[PDB]
Design a protein around this nucleic acid. Structure first.
Ligand SMILES: [Cl-]
Ligand SMILES: [Cl-]
Ligand SMILES: [Mn+2]
Ligand SMILES: [Mn+2]
Ligand SMILES: [Mn+2]
Ligand SMILES: [Mn+2]
Ligand SMILES: [Mn+2]
Ligand SMILES: [Mn+2]
Lengths: 94, 105, 84, 98, 92, 104, 96, 78
DNA sequence: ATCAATATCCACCTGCAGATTCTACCAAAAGTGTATTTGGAAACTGCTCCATCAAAAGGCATGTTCAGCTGAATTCAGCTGAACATGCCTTTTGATGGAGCAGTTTCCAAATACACTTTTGGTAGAATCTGCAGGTGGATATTGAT
DNA sequence: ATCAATATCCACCTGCAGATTCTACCAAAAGTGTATTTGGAAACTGCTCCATCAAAAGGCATGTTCAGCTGAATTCAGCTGAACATGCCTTTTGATGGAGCAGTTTCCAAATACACTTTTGGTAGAATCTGCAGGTGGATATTGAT
């Protein structure tokens, strides 16, 4: 039959992290999935455009970072860049 | 075997984000750190919204988050409002706001 | 099939008034309701136009929610909740 | 007999519908309108109920926003009652059909 | 190097107005126009192909993209010109 | 001989194809897609050039300057809509004065 | 001789609407640009074309904003544009 | 330094905008708005220049920034 | 209204540089011929879910009455902002040169793609569990009249 | 200033629709080996782009006078809100038939992949051609009073 993807389990993991005694409506979860996919498309799109601007054929974490700087507002961008750089540097220690 | 999410210490799926990057034709090549970084950012934004919405849900004495709580969260936070200025949340509604001139004299 | 006609009048005056109330409007001119019907007709026309364009590009005869979402996204009015 | 002053019930309703989130346009008439427009664009089309609902959500959201801006336009002209002139101004500044 | 639509815009100009010249800045405007419309059409077509899970962009995607992006009359004439050029191209 | 010639076009079919596939839009590009596209671009270019000439000298100037282009774009409804959020450099604005500001 | 107040205004309107030239002087604008850019990145450098482009964009934007503003002044049965009008304009525009 | 953009210049801009009569506070308000505009556009542009590992802000950086802002400008490369 | 006196605008003709247009030569696309994969149109059919219908009941739309207060119309003074003559100064033109970027290549370690195999996390189902919707009466709060 | 009439704020309870949890399949990461690019270090060069510096030519800051527009105040007709009786139609919830998605395969028209070959379009150069950009009489437009 049919198998569709979503960010539901991850959204629920993060939700349980921030508010252990809080549940979420399927509608609200739909809103969240739409949000994640939208931000995804924005970041990836901007990163694509920038990578294309400098004759580069590869989107590295740097392009993603600049994409975030462009798309996200002040503090949001700050903390986002923080979480990203953190995750990357932690990842490189395989 | 370890998932790249666990290695990066993320809840969000690094592998899936990577596949979506490759299967979206944003570039012919994709760096090793790009899906990690991106997944981290998405996870963070998700975290922030779920936080503010959670608070809004506590304020209205509810255990479960509905789109209304998400709307209140977005519109009451300046930055999330700006990031979602051209976005409509279904079943969200609007912020309670009445122009002062309209009030009884 | 029963012929559809003058359904813009289905959007009643009290409904428009409610939409105005949520918009924070206190007093409404009598000439407002028809104007609202017109603007609504234009908006809905554009959105549905693009949506159906997507629908028949997919060689489908059924308009899906995703067609509507893509249409709205293209119109600059992104909608969450039906994103699928 | 009892009677509320003109404007009071209005503010009351403003608060009421600003507290809630339900759709304000009746469902079946809206579905009729959508099917009419769509049929005029292309014949023998069928809709997922989801699509109709999405259309209604988008529509009412749009109209509420436009009504907010319109209200600002009415307040700007030192008025309280919104007028077609106000809507036309809001539409022009927005750039919908300037 | 640098590549532009300069010579092509000039040829078309000589098609429509054979005895009319064009400023350099205006040629810049035209170049920017062709580039922008290009990116619009190609982008809308790419999104179109991604929506229906198609991995190739045919002239069909281009046509639908044009129907979306261009207003009525311009859209019609563009579609007809396009189909024309395609049939003529496949005529040899 | 050239794909543009075989399509009866002035715009470069080959160049358009190359850009299309080198622009990260999709993995594969159809044979006729760049033809169609180049045709559309040539048509739009033609329209704008025509109107911008007609307007080029209702002002007595031969060379088409950005002003003439602006006039052509903004005087035509559909072109004005297509380029709704676009600024033509050194284009200026259309002569428009509100009747309310007029005396008597 | 003295022109009745409001005529030279219409005159200027017709003139600058019939023209295409930049209305802000080059050097003050460029100085402003370099100042603003400096507090983003130390001792940057600009192509002449970049500054010119910035000026075109700025003047176009401000002219349009002044059009919508003027409309907002007309709407309130006035003729003189006010900061209030500009404010309404950008608030409807979505810039606020 | 922002005062380099002066009353007659702003007046001329309003003239091209078809404005007949102008308030005194208008000029300051306009200086503010202009400041914001330049701040945003130059912000994005400088970001582009800095990703490109450059120290010279190009016209194309400005065009890209403008396009991103929703203020597409023809006649400078894009 | 159409008599004058400023000023303004316009339209004619005269004229070169600061730009346009038109040419003698070249790297890099663009085209051509020969194999190699493959996306997806075609076909068939399992399977949601869409269209449609019925019936009934109550939410709610519609049309009328009536008068409250809103917006439109008018008047008038005060002060805000346009017109203008005036005088200094920061602009614009423009010749420059020293240099510091930006753009170009040449190797090549490091990173990413590709291909196959193993493994499991993510999904679709069903079984299970529990906020809270939608009812209730009760004490406040607000609004209105007397 | 006080006392009804009515809307609204809550806390009560509780069964059910929607959310949560539990469990076998399996698409898709993940692991491992090997093929293929990649984007900056050294090394370099020639457009740009600055930074002074000497000048004029126009633009702006400035101060005075007043035309007239803005905004306060007052007035009143009429429109739009509030309350209600009347009854229609949109709900609600069920039950169908079947259209037409969408999962599964199955050949081939059409795309890609290098391998050479031909043409073109881009630069730096000559030999063009046109709108500024002044000067002048005449018709407009504007503002004042024979
Ligand atoms: Cl050197
Ligand atoms: Cl001149
Ligand atoms: Mn927490
Ligand atoms: Mn917490
Ligand atoms: Mn094709
Ligand atoms: Mn159930
Ligand atoms: Mn081969
Ligand atoms: Mn004459």
């Amino acid at each position: 039959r049919s198998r569709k993807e979503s960010y539901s389990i991850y959204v629920y993991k993060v939700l349980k992290q921030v508010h252990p005694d809080t549940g979420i409506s399927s509608k609200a979860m739909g809103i969240m999935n739409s949000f994640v996919n939208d931000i995804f498309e924005r970041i990836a799109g901007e990163a694509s455009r920038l990578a294309h601007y400098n004759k580069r054929s590869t989107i590295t974490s740097r392009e993603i970072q600049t994409a975030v700087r462009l798309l996200l507002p002040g503090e949001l961008a700050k903390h986002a860049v923080s979480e990203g750089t953190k995750a990357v540097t932690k990842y490189t220690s395989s | 075997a370890k998932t790249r999410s666990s290695r990066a210490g993320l809840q969000f799926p690094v592998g899936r984000v990577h596949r979506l990057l490759r299967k979206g034709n944003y570039s012919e090549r994709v760096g090793a750190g790009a899906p990690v970084y991106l997944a981290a950012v998405l996870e963070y934004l998700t975290a922030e919204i779920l936080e503010l919405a959670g608070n809004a849900a506590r304020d209205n004495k509810k255990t479960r988050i509905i789109p209304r709580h998400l709307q209140l969260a977005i519109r009451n936070d300046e930055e999330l409002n700006k990031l979602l200025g051209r976005v409509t949340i279904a079943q969200g509604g609007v912020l309670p706001n009445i122009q002062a001139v309209l009030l009884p004299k | 099939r029963k012929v559809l006609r003058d359904n813009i009048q289905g959007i009643t005056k009290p409904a428009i008034r409610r939409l105005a109330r949520r918009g924070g409007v206190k007093r409404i001119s009598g000439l407002i309701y028809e104007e609202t019907r017109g603007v609504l007709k234009v908006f809905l026309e554009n959105v549905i136009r693009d949506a159906v364009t997507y629908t028949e590009h997919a060689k489908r005869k059924t308009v899906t929610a995703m067609d509507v979402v893509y249409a709205l996204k293209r119109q600059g009015r992104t909608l969450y909740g039906f994103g699928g | 007999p009892h009677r509320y002053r003109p404007g009071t019930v209005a503010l009351r309703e403003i608060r009421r519908y600003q507290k809630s989130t339900e759709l304000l346009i009746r469902k079946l008439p809206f579905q009729r309108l959508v099917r009419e427009i769509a049929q005029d664009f292309k014949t023998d089309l069928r809709f997922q109920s989801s699509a109709v609902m999405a259309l209604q959500e988008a529509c009412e959201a749009y109209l509420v926003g436009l009504f907010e801006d319109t209200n600002l336009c009415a307040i700007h002209a030192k008025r309280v009652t919104i007028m077609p002139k106000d809507i036309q101004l809001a539409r022009r500044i927005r750039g919908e059909r300037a």
